[PDB]
Symmetry: D2
Subunit: 229 residues, 4 copies
C-alpha cells in the first residue's frame, strides 16, 4: 500500500495513546516525523491541550518547533508519560535495534524514563531475530573506535565506522561522537548483549533496545497491527 | 584525462614540494586523499623520511593512520613547514572557498600557520570569482543557526542548514557544531568579508580562505599547472 | 552597604524594564542570579506574565528552572526583547569585559540580538579603561591554544590557560573549549581589539563586549545609578 | 616522609616496569605527573628509548609534550603495554575509585586495554572498603543529570552535581559532559555496581575501577610496597 502509507497509519494509531497534560518523548526519523506533524495539527485544532514534547534529537526538536509544539529538555520535566519513536528492527519479543538516525543516546535516555514506550514502524522492520536485516549502531568515544571494532570480532560482528556524505570523514553524532555499525550474524540474548556492549570502555550507548518497548504499532499493507508485552 | 586522473596528477606534483624532516599539514577531501596515500607510499619505500603530519580532520587523521604516517596535533609541533589541502573554488588572486567537507575550523587553524600553503585542485575549481559556483560554508554554534540564517539573508545570501544523510537532523562538525551553506552573489573583497563574517556572534569559522594560499597546483585535462602568489 | 547588597539593588532596578510578553536573555553569574530569582518571585505573585527566558549558560538555565521561569534556546524564539547579564568590567563608554564565568560564547550570541542589553554590576566593576582590573577571557579550540598564546605576544599581553580546580587539566567550557585569560596593558579601541582577536583562526570568542551594552545599572554605596549611551 | 615523596617513590618504582619500545598509558593527577616527568628525564638521558605515550587527559598530554615524550591517541597504536595512573581509593582486592580529576572516561578506555595497569598511590588512598572516604564520580550526558541523581538517591547514594570554581555552572569534562559525585555508605560489590551504573542510559562512565588494576605501587612511610593479587 506504499511504505509511506504504512508509516502514517502507524502514526495515526499512536495518537490514541496521547492525552491532555502529558509530557511526550518525541522520537527521531521518518515514521515518527508523521506522528509529530499529526500531533501539532491536533494541538492547533484544540483537540488536545497542555502537551509538552521532549525531543530525542535536533531533527525532532526542529520539527516540533515548526509545528508549534512546546518543548522542554529532560531536566525540565518531572516525568515522561509516553515516548514515541521508530526502530530499524523489531523482534518477536519486541527487542529493537535503533540508531540508523544516530540519535540513540538521547533516545534511550528519554525512552528509558517513559511510563509507556510506543514504537512505530512499517512491515519491513519486523524480523525473526535481531540482526536478521540490520547492524547495531554503537556510539563510541572517537579514539576508541578501532579497538572496539577489533574487540567485536569475538562476536563475529562485521563492524564498520560510519562515514559522512554531507561531511568528509566519520559521521559525528549530536554529542561529538563516532558511530560504529556492527553487523552481528545473530544476537541470541539481546538484553545481555545490550549490557555487554555498554560495559566496554569507550562505548557510549548501543542500538539494542531490549526490555524497554511497551507497545509496538505496526503499519501493515492491510491496516494496522500491534504487538504487546 | 578525467577528473580523478586530474586530481591524481595534482597530488603527485605536490610531492615534489615535500622534503625529509618536514611537519606537513594534511588536508581534507578527495584530492588531498591521493596526496596522503602517495606520501604514505613514499615513506614506506624510504623515498622520504622523518615526516610528521598534522591532520586537519578526522578524515585526514584516519587516512594517515591507515597509511602509517606519524601524526601530531598542532600543539605538539614547533611549526608547520607545508600544509597541503584542497578547495571548492579558487579565484584569479588565489583566494579560496573551502568547507564542503565541513572541516574548515581545523583546516584554517593549521593552514594559517604553515610556511607554505599548497592547494590541490582539478580544472573545475577555477572560477572567475569567488561564489561563481559554490556557496560559502559557515560553521555555527548550534543554537545560533536560525538567527544567523536570517541575518545572512538580509545580506543577500541564500543560506541553508546542511543536513545529514548518514544521520538524521543537521550535519554535525568534528567540533560538535552545525554548518550553513550560504550562496553569496560574487565576492569582490574576500579578505574583508572573511574577517567581518567571523565577527558575528555564533559564527565560528567561514569557508573563505583569503590571503593565505601560496601555491595552487592544478590538474588539467592534459597535464599540470602551477599558480603562485 | 556591602557587595551583595549592591548587587541586589541593581537586580531590583532591572526588573523595572521587564514587561509582560517579553523574551528575556538570562545572563550568567551572581549579580544576575539575583535578577533571575526576583523575576521568578514576581512571576509567582502574578505581577508579570507571559515571559520566556533564554539562558546564556547551564547556570542560568538551572536557576530559571528552579524558579519556574519558562525557558527556550535562541532558535525557539522570534527575538530577544531584553537581555540581562553582568560584567567583569565596565568602562566609561560602556564597553565591557565579560567571561569570568566562561559563558562568553552563549552570552554574546544572545546579547548581540537583544533589543535592549542591560548590564548589572556593583561599583567594583567600573573601570577607567578596559583591563584596569581584569583580564580578557578568550575561548579557543583546544589544539590551537599554545599557538594562540604565543601569537598574543605581539600585544604585550600576559596570557595564561585557565586551569580547573574541580577537574584536573584546563577549564572546559560548556562547548568543549579552553579559555585563555589575557591581561593586555590597556585597550585603546575595545571594538578593534574585539575584532582582531576573533580574526585569529582558533579563537572562537573573546570577552570584550564593545558597542553592545545599552544600559548599565550600577549598585553603589549611595544607592542605584543608571548609565546609558 | 612527606606526602609528595610517597608519590615520588611510587613513581620512581613504576619506571622499573618500563622498557624500550613500549606504548604507555599516561594517567592523570599529581602522583602520575611525577612519573611522566621521570619518564621524560629517563628518555632525555637515553636510559630508555622509542617509547610512545597515550595520554588519558589534556593534563597528561600537555605534561608529556613539555617533556618531549612522543604521544598518540589510542587509535594510533596497536597496543598499550603498560598504563600508569593514580587513584582516589584502593580496596584490599585492588579495586579502585578514580575520577576526582574528571578524566575517568579516557582513563578507563586506555587502562582497560593495557597489558599491565599499574596504579600509583601514597598510604592514604588505601581503604577497608570502597567509598570509605570518597564518592564515586559518574560522568553523565548533561540533560540526564537530574534524573540520574534522583535514580541514584533511590539507593542511598548522596549525589551532587559537581560545580565549577574557575567557571560558573557545572564542571565540564573533556568530552563536554557533567560529573555527578555519588557517596554510597559502602560498595561491598565494586564490579557489580560498576556495571550497573554504566547500564543506566545517560551514564557514560563511572569511577569504580574494579578488577582491572594489575599492580598497585604504594608509597609507604616505610619506603614502598608492590601489591598484586
Ligand atoms: O532509531 C532511529 O534512529 C530511528 O527511529 C529509526 O529507528 C527509524 O527511523 P525511520 O522511522 O525513518 O525508519
Ligand atoms: O575544504 C574542504 O573541505 C576540501 O578541501 C574541499 O575544498 C575539496 O574537496 P575535494 O578535493 O574532494 O573536491
Ligand atoms: O561574564 C560573566 O561571566 C559574568 O556575567 C560575570 O562577568 C559577572 O559575574 P558576577 O555578577 O558574579 O560578578
Ligand atoms: O582519577 C584521577 O582522576 C586521578 O588519578 C586522581 O584521582 C588521583 O590523583 P592524585 O594522584 O593527584 O591524588
Ligand atoms: Cl536514531
Ligand atoms: Cl572529519
Ligand atoms: Cl572541509
Ligand atoms: Cl552525512
Ligand atoms: Cl539530530
Ligand atoms: Cl561568563
Ligand atoms: Cl573548576
Ligand atoms: Cl584534562
Ligand atoms: Cl554553565
Ligand atoms: Na561530547
Ligand atoms: Na564543541
Amino acid at each position: 500500500m506504499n511504505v509511506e502509507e504504512m508509516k502514517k497509519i502507524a502514526a495515526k494509531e499512536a495518537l490514541k495513546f496521547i492525552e491532555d497534560d502529558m509530557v511526550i518523548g518525541l522520537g527521531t526519523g521518518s515514521t515518527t516525523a508523521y506522528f509529530i506533524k499529526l500531533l501539532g495539527e491536533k494541538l492547533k485544532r484544540g483537540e488536545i491541550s497542555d502537551i509538552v514534547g521532549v525531543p530525542t534529537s535536533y531533527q525532532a526538536k526542529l520539527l516540533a518547533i515548526e509545528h508549534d509544539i512546546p518543548i522542554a529538555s529532560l531536566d525540565q520535566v518531572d516525568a515522561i508519560d509516553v515516548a514515541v519513536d521508530g526502530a530499524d528492527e523489531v523482534d518477536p519479543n519486541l527487542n529493537l535495534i535503533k540508531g540508523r538516525g544516530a540519535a540513540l543516546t538521547m533516545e534511550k535516555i528519554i525512552e528509558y524514563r517513559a511510563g509507556t514506550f510506543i514504537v512505530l514502524v512499517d512491515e519491513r522492520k519486523l524480523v525473526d531475530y535481531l540482526c536478521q536485516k540490520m547492524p547495531v549502531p554503537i556510539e563510541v568515544i572517537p579514539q576508541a573506535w578501532k579497538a572496539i571494532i577489533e574487540e567485536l570480532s569475538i562476536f563475529n560482528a562485521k563492524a564498520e565506522l560510519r562515514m559522512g556524505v554531507n561531511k568528509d570523514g566519520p559521521v559525528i553524532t549530536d554529542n561529538g561522537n563516532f558511530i560504529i555499525d556492527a553487523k552481528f550474524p545473530r544476537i541470541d540474548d539481546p538484553l545481555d548483549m545490550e549490557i555487554e556492549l555498554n560495559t566496554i570502555p569507550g562505548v557510549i550507548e548501543n542500538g539494542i533496545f531490549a526490555d524497554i518497548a511497551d507497545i509496538v504499532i505496526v503499519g501493515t499493507r492491510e491496516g494496522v497491527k500491534k504487538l504487546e508485552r
